[PDB]
Amino acid sequence: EPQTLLETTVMVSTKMPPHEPQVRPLGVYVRTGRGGPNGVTRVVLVRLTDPTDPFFLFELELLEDDYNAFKQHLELLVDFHGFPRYLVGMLRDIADGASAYELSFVLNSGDSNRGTLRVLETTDFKTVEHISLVLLRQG
Amino acid sequence: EPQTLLETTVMVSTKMPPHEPQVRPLGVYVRTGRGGPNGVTRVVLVRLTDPTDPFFLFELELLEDDYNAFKQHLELLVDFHGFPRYLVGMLRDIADGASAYELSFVLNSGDSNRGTLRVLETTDFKTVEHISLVLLRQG
């Protein structure tokens, strides 16, 4: 049951500081499967791509083994099964044009090995970060 | 016009890591006035106290001079006049029992010279931080 829960396009404000950002469409992909040391750990894969650029490929791979730490650090209320569903609900609503939330992706440093994907909500008073995830480049 | 905008009591989850937290009533106090190098800079003072303990006194003093940096770093939409009003609205609603938000105050390190006051909202999916402020002990 290695299932794709989301494969879609979303607008993202991207930047490598100190450069100023651009807003552009990115592919986003969320899949559950198996991995880890003996091939049996449940994983959640979150991938971000640029259709117009192959070098742009960043991934977070989250193992159930590390979830408790991850959960505590982000103050998540959902369990490992719930986590990717929650994420997908948000991302799908943003893709549909049907959400109050925005996406930002900030690279470190081209020669960037990682970026931080943020889900943001702008209230009357400020922008509020709902979640941040670190995604690593490869391939 | 050095005016007190809020003087009240609020429940706060306090902790000095690695100790576990307690929830307890704290005095909170927000005042606008003047200060800075020549006595003319507008300031916002946010004070946290413990009625049952004099050594517990922490303050943030925010000068208009530094607001732009502070604004940008927290992604605030309000200006310097608006900022303390917004903060007070939140704190007063929490004091009244009439808010979806909570307060946390995490000390560094008794021998703590500072803590971070957080305004938190628990959604169905996680706890979301709306704002954090660093307050310094003195006196």
Question: In sequence order, what are the residues at sequence separation of 6 or more whose Cβ sits closer than 8 angstroms to the Cβ of residue A137?
Answer: A56, A57, A58, A112, A113, A114, A115
Euclidean distance between CA atoms B63 and B44, whole angstroms: 7
CA distances to A50, A120, A125 from A21, rounded to whole Å, are 15, 15, 22
Experimental method: X-ray
**A chain contacts of residue B123, beta-carbon cutoff 8 Å:** 77, 130
The Cβ of residue A83 has, within 10 Å, a number of other Cβ atoms equal to 22
List domains and CATH numbers for chain B: 1-139 (2.170.210.20)
Question: In sequence order, what are the residues at sequence separation of 6 or more whose Cβ sits closer than 8 angstroms to the Cβ of residue A125?
Answer: B76, B77, B78, B86
Contact B130 A126 (CB under 8 A): yes
Q: Resolution limit in angstroms?
A: 2.2
**A chain contacts of residue B84, beta-carbon cutoff 8 Å:** none
Return the SS3 of A130. Answer: strand
E strands, chain B, in order = 4-15, 22-35, 41-50, 53-63, 101-107, 114-122, 127-137
Residues from A in contact with B at Cβ < 8 Å: 74-78, 86, 122-131
